[PDB]
Amino acid sequence: AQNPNCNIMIFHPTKEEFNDFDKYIAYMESQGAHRAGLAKIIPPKEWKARETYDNISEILIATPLQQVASGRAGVFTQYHKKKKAMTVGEYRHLANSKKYQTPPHQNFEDLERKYWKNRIYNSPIYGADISGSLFDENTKQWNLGHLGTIQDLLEKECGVVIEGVNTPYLYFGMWKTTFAWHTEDMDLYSINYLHLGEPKTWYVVPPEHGQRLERLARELFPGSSRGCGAFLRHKVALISPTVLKENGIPFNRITQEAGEFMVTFPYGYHAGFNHGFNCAEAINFATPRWIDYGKMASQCSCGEARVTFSMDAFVRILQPERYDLWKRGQD
Ligand SMILES: O=C(O)CNC(=O)C(=O)O
Ligand SMILES: [Mg+2]
Ligand code: NI
Ligand SMILES: [Zn+2]
């Protein structure tokens, strides 16, 4: 069995290997990459996403979100307070202000220590889930707006044609902006490209061990767990690496830098934080191997998770027994 310790693997494809996206994902899996839940892909030196980032300041962040924490430094939830619209140039200025800017630090490990010590005492503002793309239309390789759609994959594997679309999303971050512990909708894959700016640190639990994280989360967030049998779908709970280690939860960590891709694999729980002002692009995708995970994915039906239009068909076809309860939670 390849990668039996479930380490995060880093890949350096050649320009020739960068042509066929599906083939390369399958290659990474042949080497055991999925066992970690997360892999890094460093593009060949010949590749670029676009020519420059000099002309992005006029993108609008219609609903910036202030991430307010509650709890203790290593075990907390966050809620998202809506703020007034601002442009990417305005948001960049805010991220660099004395109130929000990255503090002085020695290295990524020192900054990680500072994050976990101090995160809860601040409320950073995140531009999330902005439909759009920064890939140039002429970028032919690993262009996240030109991937094969999940609806086409389901039709190819299973024979059923379904409604829905699959487009990318932009994220504008600042110091301490946080992504809570989660798997993807319907336990899909994700791919994330860090277009510019400061790093993103990731934590991940191997898919084979995801239920260990879920059991800890139920213990640590006992009211939330009574409220919903899949409350991590709410995407609000944080648990630090120190707390994970104290509770024996298997996990790994890695820092993504500008110009690098990360892939999350089906049922790979992940969480993390941004080091400073940055911009990332991400999208969900599927392969044949996903279908069995989609059939078994948990679902939130309490009303909190609320998701895209295109998840309806996935539940309807892959999980017909759950569909009526889930759809009630959507309405
Ligand atoms: O970068 C972020 O805030 C969160 N991204 C992801 O969870 C992802 O790409 O799957
Ligand atoms: Mg612009
Ligand atoms: Ni994710
Ligand atoms: Zn719920």
Take atom 7 of ligand 1 and give the residue whose Cα is closest. Answer: 179
Tokens matching residue 4 = 């039996």
Residue type, 154: L
- 217 within 8 A of 306, measured Cβ to Cβ: no
Residue 247 and residue 239: Cα distance in Å, rounded?
Answer: 11
**Technique used by the depositors:** X-ray
* Ligand closest in space to the Cα of 306: 4
Domain boundaries, the chain: 1-331
**Ligand 1-lining residues (CB < 6 angstroms):** 171, 179, 190, 192, 200, 264, 280, 282
Name the architecture of domain 1-331.
Sandwich (2.60)
DSSP H helical ranges for the chain: 21-30, 88-95, 108-118, 150-158, 210-220, 222-227, 241-246, 290-296, 311-318, 320-330
Tokens matching residue 248 = 């024996």
Cα(31) to centroid(ligand 3), Å = 22
Take atom 9 of ligand 1 and give the residue whose Cα is closest. Answer: 192
Residue 13 and residue 118: Cα distance in Å, rounded?
Answer: 38
Q: For the chain, what is the total number of helices (H) and then of strands (E)?
A: 10, 16
Residue 304 and residue 302: Cα distance in Å, rounded?
Answer: 6
- 265 within 8 A of 202, measured Cβ to Cβ: no
Dihedral of the alpha carbons of 295, 298, 300, 305, in degrees to the nearest 10: -80
Tokens matching residue 143 = 């262009």
Q: Which positions make up the binding site for 2-oxoglutarate?
A: 126, 192, 200, 235
**Resolution of the coordinates in A?**
1.2
